[PDB]
Amino acid sequence: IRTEKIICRDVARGYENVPIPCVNGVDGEPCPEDYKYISENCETSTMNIDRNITHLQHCTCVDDCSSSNCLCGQLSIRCWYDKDGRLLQEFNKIEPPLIFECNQACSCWRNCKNRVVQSGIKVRLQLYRTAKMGWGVRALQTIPQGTFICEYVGELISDAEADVREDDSYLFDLDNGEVYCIDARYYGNISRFINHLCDPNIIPVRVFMLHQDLRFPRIAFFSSRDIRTGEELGFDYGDRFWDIKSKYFTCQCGSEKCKHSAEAIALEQSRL
Amino acid sequence: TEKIICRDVARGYENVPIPCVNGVDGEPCPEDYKYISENCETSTMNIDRNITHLQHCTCVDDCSSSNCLCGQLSIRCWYDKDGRLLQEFNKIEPPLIFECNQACSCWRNCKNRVVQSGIKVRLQLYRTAKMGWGVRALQTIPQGTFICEYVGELISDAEADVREDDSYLFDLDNDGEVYCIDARYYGNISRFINHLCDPNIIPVRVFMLHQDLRFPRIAFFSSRDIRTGEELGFDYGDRFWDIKSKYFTCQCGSEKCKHSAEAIALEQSRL
Ligand SMILES: CNc1cc(C)nc(Nc2ccc(OC)c(OCCCN3CCCC3)c2)n1
Ligand SMILES: CNc1cc(C)nc(Nc2ccc(OC)c(OCCCN3CCCC3)c2)n1
Ligand SMILES: C[S@@+](CC[C@H](N)C(=O)[O-])C[C@H]1O[C@@H](n2cnc3c(N)ncnc32)[C@H](O)[C@@H]1O
Ligand SMILES: C[S@@+](CC[C@H](N)C(=O)[O-])C[C@H]1O[C@@H](n2cnc3c(N)ncnc32)[C@H](O)[C@@H]1O
Ligand SMILES: [Zn+2]
Ligand SMILES: [Zn+2]
Ligand SMILES: [Zn+2]
Ligand SMILES: [Zn+2]
Ligand SMILES: [Zn+2]
Ligand SMILES: [Zn+2]
Ligand SMILES: [Zn+2]
Ligand SMILES: [Zn+2]
Numbered sequence: 223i224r225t226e227k228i229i230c231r232d233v234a235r236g237y238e239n240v241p242i243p244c245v246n247g248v249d250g251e252p253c254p255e256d257y258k259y260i261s262e263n264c265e266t267s268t269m270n271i272d273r274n275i276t277h278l279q280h281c282t283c284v285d286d287c288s289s290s291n292c293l294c295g296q297l298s299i300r301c302w303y304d305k306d307g308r309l310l311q312e313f314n315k316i317e318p319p320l321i322f323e324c325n326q327a328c329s330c331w332r333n334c335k336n337r338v339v340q341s342g343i344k345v346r347l348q349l350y351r352t353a354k355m356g357w358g359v360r361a362l363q364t365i366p367q368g369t370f371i372c373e374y375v376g377e378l379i380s381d382a383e384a385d386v387r388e389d390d391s392y393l394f395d396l397d398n399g400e401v402y403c404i405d406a407r408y409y410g411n412i413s414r415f416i417n418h419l420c421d422p423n424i425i426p427v428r429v430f431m432l433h434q435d436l437r438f439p440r441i442a443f444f445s446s447r448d449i450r451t452g453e454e455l456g457f458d459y460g461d462r463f464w465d466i467k468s469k470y471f472t473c474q475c476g477s478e479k480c481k482h483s484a485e486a487i488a489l490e491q492s493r494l
Numbered sequence: 495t496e497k498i499i500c501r502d503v504a505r506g507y508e509n510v511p512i513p514c515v516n517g518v519d520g521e522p523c524p525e526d527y528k529y530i531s532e533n534c535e536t537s538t539m540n541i542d543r544n545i546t547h548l549q550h551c552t553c554v555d556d557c558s559s560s561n562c563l564c565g566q567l568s569i570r571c572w573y574d575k576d577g578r579l580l581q582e583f584n585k586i587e588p589p590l591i592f593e594c595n596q597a598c599s600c601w602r603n604c605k606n607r608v609v610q611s612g613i614k615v616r617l618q619l620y621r622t623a624k625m626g627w628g629v630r631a632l633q634t635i636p637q638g639t640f641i642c643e644y645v646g647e648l649i650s651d652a653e654a655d656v657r658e659d660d661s662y663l664f665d666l667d668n669d670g671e672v673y674c675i676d677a678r679y680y681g682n683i684s685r686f687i688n689h690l691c692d693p694n695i696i697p698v699r700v701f702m703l704h705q706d707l708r709f710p711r712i713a714f715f716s717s718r719d720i721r722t723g724e725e726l727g728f729d730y731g732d733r734f735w736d737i738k739s740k741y742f743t744c745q746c747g748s749e750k751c752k753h754s755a756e757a758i759a760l761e762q763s764r765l
Binding site: 235236326377 | 505506507528530531532534535536537538540543544545546596597600601602603647680
């Protein structure tokens with residue numbers, strides 16, 4: 223009875239390396255427009271990010287930064303990107319290390335091997351209307367394990383500002399006393415529409431590029447396994463989110479392994 | 495003879511490569527500076543990057559209409575449909591340009607985004623006969639075309655005041671309390687552009703991703719048609735020549751030259 227309609231040829235309005243279309247084959251919900259699409263983190267009130275170019279640790283490489291003498295690699299133990307820009311198979315997917323990409327202070331060229339996240343989105347993604355979870359994001363192509371997908375982009379806000387945001391649905395915690403969040407509620411990119419999955423296929427990794435202010439890592443999603451075409455993308459939102467939200471709604475991810483469904487929570491409340 | 499001694503002085507940081515040739519002498523490709531493609535800071539400048547402070551448009555076309563708010567913040571959008579300054583653009587007294595930004599409703603490829611889109615023309619760093627390194631066009635360039643930005647280290651008046659080398663400074667005209675770009679230590683292709691008494695490019699103040707009026711970004715546009723091989727240059731202005739004249743004199747070689755040893759002698763000797 224109902225057709226899949228294409229309702230936006232590019233929700234990023236041309237701001238990404240590729241267009242991100244939106245389709246809806248499920249209901250009458252038109253293209254989401256209660257937010258401003260931005261491709262890189264914004265600020266409302268000042269974050270006082272340390273941008274002093276002299277504070278950048280940087281490499282003195284004269285090659286494409288594949289030697290273990292690259293200081294940038296060394297700051298993360300080693301450079302973790304293979305030759306096609308994908309995380310090495312031994313990459314710690316459980317506790318990813320901080321990645322330091324090469325920056326404007328490095329001697330190397332813009333096209334060295336240590337610049338994956340800064341080069342932006344390469345895989346083809348689609349915003350689509352899911353059965354039970356509002357909008358979601360899926361792959362239009364297969365994506366090998368360890369490939370960079372997109373960054374979690376938003377408005378940088380302080381601990382205190384987060385405390386009083388009305389909607390807490392789109393917060394990402396920036397990990398390291400004085401702490402900050404990304405809030406994608408009013409300003410965000412394609413990643414604000416990525417759903418929680420109890421069986422995730424992407425992991426967030428903290429990355430530094432043009433600054434190395436440790437209060438403000440940038441959050442890069444990489445696939446944690448090969449992803450088949452058409453699969454929904456999803457990461458583990460984590461307990462902070464679910465401890466709060468569990469009483470308003472439960473997880474609809476549909477996995478055998480789901481630990482946040484109405485069923486999982488009732489089995490748990492009773493196993494206690 | 496004239497050999498290519500760097501394939502790209504910008505190390506792939508620009509949209510296009512900028513080669514270095516030397517057919518005049520034995521000087522190697524300059525390297526006493528760090529090539530950057532965007533302005534940098536050393537000491538903190540606190541640029542206002544509050545997205546809510548951005549004046550922005552509500553267009554859902556390509557921003558060609560006179561109703562584009564961003565266009566009006568400079569009387570009119572000054573760019574034709576090919577991204578060139580209008581013929582009637584005030585080349586003597588250029589107004590402030592406000593390009594579209596991340597707060598505008600429009601698309602990234604609207605018509606009000608010329609400078610933020612980067613270098614498009616083919617430029618070359620070459621060795622000149624008499625003024626060290628210079629920059630020249632490797633193609634014809636019509637009047638009103640964006641060439642490159644003057645990129646460097648943002649610094650205060652006080653800091654400029656104590657800089658040993660004052661050869662690479664650009665004043666950011668502003669209200670109260672003023673800043674400079676110093677391209678001495680950190681710079682892009684434009685640090686190599688020489689002064690000409692018969693100039694073929696002009697600097698324009700432009701705002702893009704922020705609108706902190708202390709820190710306009712400086713875009714060079716051609717002020718007439720330029721032929722392949724022509725040296726680019728602008729008028730450095732009296733402030734530079736006043737300081738510099740007692741050290742060296744203008745070698746631009748134009749009959750209009752007003753800063754040569756000769757021209758300076760004829761004025762001292764009208765006194
Ligand atoms: C309240 N004051 C604060 C203050 C600080 C520093 N952090 C937080 N974090 C936080 C609060 C509520 C959350 O959930 C309702 C939450 O979820 C993070 C994981 C789920 N996100 C959803 C999309 C991006 C990832 C984080 N809240
Ligand atoms: C000393 N304290 C200052 C302080 C401030 C606010 N401005 C300046 N400006 C300045 C000083 C010396 C200069 O020249 C010797 C000069 O040249 C302006 C134009 C020449 N530039 C050369 C490359 C780009 C254009 C500007 N100096
Ligand atoms: C970051 S937004 C994800 C995009 C969201 N689907 C939308 O339509 O905007 C997070 C919100 O999506 C919904 N959501 C995400 N993952 C879910 C899940 N596994 N089960 C149920 N609802 C989920 C909840 O409304 C949650 O607060
Ligand atoms: C911003 S740099 C331009 C690049 C410089 N030619 C170089 O080789 O690095 C300015 C300096 O270039 C030289 N210069 C530029 N225009 C000149 C001119 N018209 N006559 C003589 N020297 C000039 C002077 O040394 C001046 O202080
Ligand atoms: Zn390196
Ligand atoms: Zn590198
Ligand atoms: Zn490096
Ligand atoms: Zn689940
Ligand atoms: Zn507009
Ligand atoms: Zn605009
Ligand atoms: Zn526009
Ligand atoms: Zn002259």
